[PDB]
């Protein structure tokens with residue numbers, strides 16, 4: 001009677017809540033991962049993400065072998081294959097860590113129900129969050145739609161520490177392997193076999209080992225300057241751990257512990273502040289994940305009533321130029337180029353290009369949300385939807401109407417155009433002054449396009465549409 005542990009976005013053996021809980025029940029612990037066609041074949045899957053995922057799985061296969069058992073690989077529909085696998089193995093139970101997204105939660109409910117019908121226990125525990133969505137509630141027992149109060153609560157809650165890595169596992173026998181032979185893939189498919197290609201690199205190399213190494217390195221040095229270095233795209237001031245957190249190559253308790261230890265080690269007020277600021281970013285992460293959990297309709301698009309009626313202009317040609325980094329706005333194009341070429345973008349840049357697509361181009365932001373999901377190595381529904389709702393204050397933590405001025409943003413966060421010239425080398429000959437203002441002479445512009453829109457006119461247009469709608473309602 002073995003216990004199966006179903007991995008999804010927790011591709012590591014260390015600090016894994018459900019895995020550690022399973023090990024406490026049995027040493028005959030076998031891991032499994034199911035390549036779900038509804039996920040892998042989605043038009044919203046990003047090649048960079050498949051590449052990172054695949055790399056994480058290669059290491060996980062090794063970790064299980066070294067631990068004493070193995071990682072089973074399946075390809076097909078979870079609610080059909082997992083119960084069948086469990087039944088063929090006469091599994092005592094199937095464990096996994098809970099999801100916050102609509103698809104995963106619906107899927108899990110079905111798998112759990114199928115397992116129950118088969119008389120097999122299903123244990124679903126919280127792992128990817130320091131505090132589950134049901135632990136953080138207002139005085140009236142309700143979820144938060146405003147960040148301030150959420151943080152006040154979240155910050156005061158006792159923090160959990162990392163759990164133990166399972167050891168001394170017992171592998172499946174030949175007879176057990178024969179019983180499940182039909183449900184398994186003989187080996188982990190290569191990226192190319194899956195029909196994907198990616199050669200743009202990663203913010204952090206794939207796998208548990210690389211993630212843990214990055215966390216330690218960051219907390220050992222860079223984290224001390226996080227504030228204000230986190231604001232400048234030209235600087236490598238952030239952790240680059242986003243895909244590791246999205247796929248769980250690193251445990252959230254490990255991340256919190258490393259930062260906490262660095263804070264206790266530091267004797268500098270500035271360093272301590274920088275570390276606290278990084279820790280709060282983890283809080284923002286939970287704010288958006290808890291929001292998606294409590295208000296799943298957020299995934300459908302503009303949340304607030306007014307925004308569900310916004311008269312998006314939707315000029316496809318403008319959207320296309322945005323996707324191809326041909327907007328004529330240096331700060332925006334450099335950012336879009338970084339995204340398509342490397343699958344990652346500095347947060348200040350995500351804010352900048354999002355504001356541009358939504359406010360300047362006036363394109364339904366779901367188009368941008370989707371493009372980001374089709375290219376981000378860290379593409380995450382909760383954080384991505386949170387970022388795009390943010391571009392219009394159409395969801396959680398709404399703020400008064402505001403429109404970023406690309407030139408103002410560039411001058412403030414890329415004052416010497418170092419980031420711009422880095423991703424737009426064909427403009428390295430241009431003075432930072434003009435790259436920031438976005439006013440480049442045709443001769444020095446070469447093949448670089450002219451601005452696709454006039455910011456002042458677009459800003460007036462967006463405000464006019466907003467004010468007219470607000471009045472009509």
Ligand SMILES: Cc1cc2nc3c(=O)[nH]c(=O)nc-3n(C[C@H](O)[C@@H](O)[C@@H](O)COP(=O)(O)OP(=O)(O)OC[C@H]3O[C@@H](n4cnc5c(N)ncnc54)[C@H](O)[C@@H]3O)c2cc1C
Nearest residue numbers: 238239240241242285347350351354378379380383384387
């Ligand atoms: C339009 C838009 C889309 C976004 N899309 C994503 C996305 O698909 N996936 C993703 O994980 N984040 C997204 N972000 C949030 C963000 O830009 C980062 O998580 C990312 O830049 C991570 O870089 P890092 O790992 O170096 O972050 P660090 O600065 O080192 O922060 C550490 C961790 O905190 C979390 N984090 C930081 N900023 C935020 C935030 N604003 N919201 C949620 N989590 C945050 C991430 O897990 C990150 O790895 C989006 C933001 C915007 C404005």
